[PDB]
Assembly symmetry: C2
Homo-oligomer: 334 residues x 2
């Protein structure tokens, strides 16, 4: 409606500034395209700059950040050499973009040495972790999360930190980064589960490990939830960045609602939904999967189920002790 | 004496580098590859010759060393002919660069001067490097032109950096003139140098000479013009008389040693 406008506008800006550079320095039309493809990356700088009060400073920090993120993404496509684009333009625009990023970021920076400082503190953790990421393919959530925390979380954390350091007054330093590192892993999960298929593109490590039973669907859900919390948490710390709240819920829920299911089955995570009631002196428990007819009568939910063959058992529970997946079935009917 | 200080820096520089590469995850294979870059680990010495305090000098000499090796790794990563792991190359390359930026900035009079110099002609350099492999050269004019960027501009910014991190009374433009000129003499050397390794195609300039598309004398002339440009640079005050035999050493080597191999 409005703030969604600002993001679209910032992303537009960053895309331009980025492609104008890739162009001027020699990038072929092929690569200039490839860099405008990167939408998520070109948008993020916007979220990172959310705590920046003066709009002009904000625009500048955002695009500088945009510059490096792309520069860095390019150095990666450069290692994979699966992009089919030219290795030289890749390499050189990589450098060009980086150098300009460094230049603009330092112009807005609080203390001259703050920029190189940040890019150095975790440089080995980053670089070497990225080396180990691909040395060995992870095999359970524990390890996936481990790798992700470096090439995903640290990577963006640094920009989070840089955004704070170049964003004038009232920057909740550690909080911006905490947002970045959290959000980063959420989208990193999304990315994994997202298969575009082009070239010789592997099924996402996490997706694969998910589809192979090496990682339990519910666990993914838990983590997705931990990350949303860790995120919302950060954007809360004062002075706060209320705007990012919906952003966070947006990507987390996308993974959950849209992506997650492409890999799990009919049954997402957790156990199969059950209804517990007392019937004919007994104790019962039926999976909503076997519940046929179900209606309402005041504040009770009456129903019928498949009890064993052609046998139709019955029940009635208070809407209170009625599981969500059953109160839903009321809807489909009347 | 003097040759003694050269060797010492090279050793010191090689170790700053391999030690860095080593601990960021580079394999024993790459670490070696980096210390094999001899000229490159030596040249920061020459660039820091106008530097007085020998501590500051060895600090600037090695930092620049990190970046030159990193940029050189960036290269091997676009030629993908070293048969070294692409990932290791990429990661180290970045790690060494980030360290070098951090070091040079701690040694500079004004930190903002490092990125300034790096951005200044970043486009000149980057694109000229693209254009260079986009259309190989056919006559000494074009070769010289391409060399001017990937070779001359490349080194030039390091000389600029050294003048900026080198403290008081550094003849900025002169340190640089030295770099862009000497840079091109070693680039011709390097071209005319054939090691046989993997799929190393005869040096464009060496080819052109053997094809007849570039005249021996015209190569001899250039070499001399560059010899002059460099002595000229090191003569300007305060001056770095040290670099004189260095200039002759390298310039005569290409003349006496390399040129005859390509007279084709």
């Amino acid at each position: 409606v409005d703030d969604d406008d600002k993001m679209l506008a910032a992303e537009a800006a960053n895309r331009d500034h980025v492609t104008r550079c890739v162009a001027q320095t020699g990038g072929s039309p092929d690569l200039v395209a490839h860099t405008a493809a990167l939408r998520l990356y070109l948008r993020v700088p916007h979220f990172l700059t959310e705590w920046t009060t003066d709009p002009d400073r904000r625009a500048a920090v955002s695009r500088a950040l945009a510059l490096d993120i792309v520069s860095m993404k390019l150095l990666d496509d450069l290692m994979d050499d699966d992009t089919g684009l030219d290795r030289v333009e890749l390499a050189c625009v990589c450098l060009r973009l980086h150098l300009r990023a460094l230049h603009e970021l330092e112009s807005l920076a609080r203390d001259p040495k703050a920029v190189t400082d940040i890019l150095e503190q975790d440089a080995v953790h980053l670089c070497g972790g990225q080396i180990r990421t691909k040395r060995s393919r992870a095999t359970n959530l524990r390890e996936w999360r481990a790798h992700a925390s470096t090439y995903g979380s640290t990577f963006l954390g640094r920009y989070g930190a840089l955004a704070a350091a170049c964003g004038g007054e009232g920057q909740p330093a550690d909080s911006v980064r905490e947002f970045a590192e959290a959000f980063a892993m959420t989208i990193t999960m999304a990315d994994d589960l997202t298969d575009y298929d082009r070239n010789g593109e592997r099924d996402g490590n996490l997706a694969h490990l998910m589809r192979t039973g090496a990682v339990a669907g519910q666990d993914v859900v838990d983590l997705l939830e931990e990350l949303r919390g860790r995120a919302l948490a950060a954007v809360a710390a004062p002075p706060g960045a209320p705007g990012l709240v919906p952003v966070v819920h947006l990507y987390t829920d996308d993974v959950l609602v849209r992506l997650l299911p492409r890999h799990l089955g009919e049954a997402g995570a957790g156990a199969m939904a059950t209804v517990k009631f007392k019937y004919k002196g007994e104790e019962k428990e039926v999976d909503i999967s076997k519940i046929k007819k179900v209606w309402r009568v005041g504040k009770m939910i009456s129903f019928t189920y498949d009890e064993g063959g052609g046998k139709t058992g019955r029940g009635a529970v208070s809407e209170k002790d009625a599981p969500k997946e059953l109160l839903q079935m009321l809807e489909k009917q009347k």
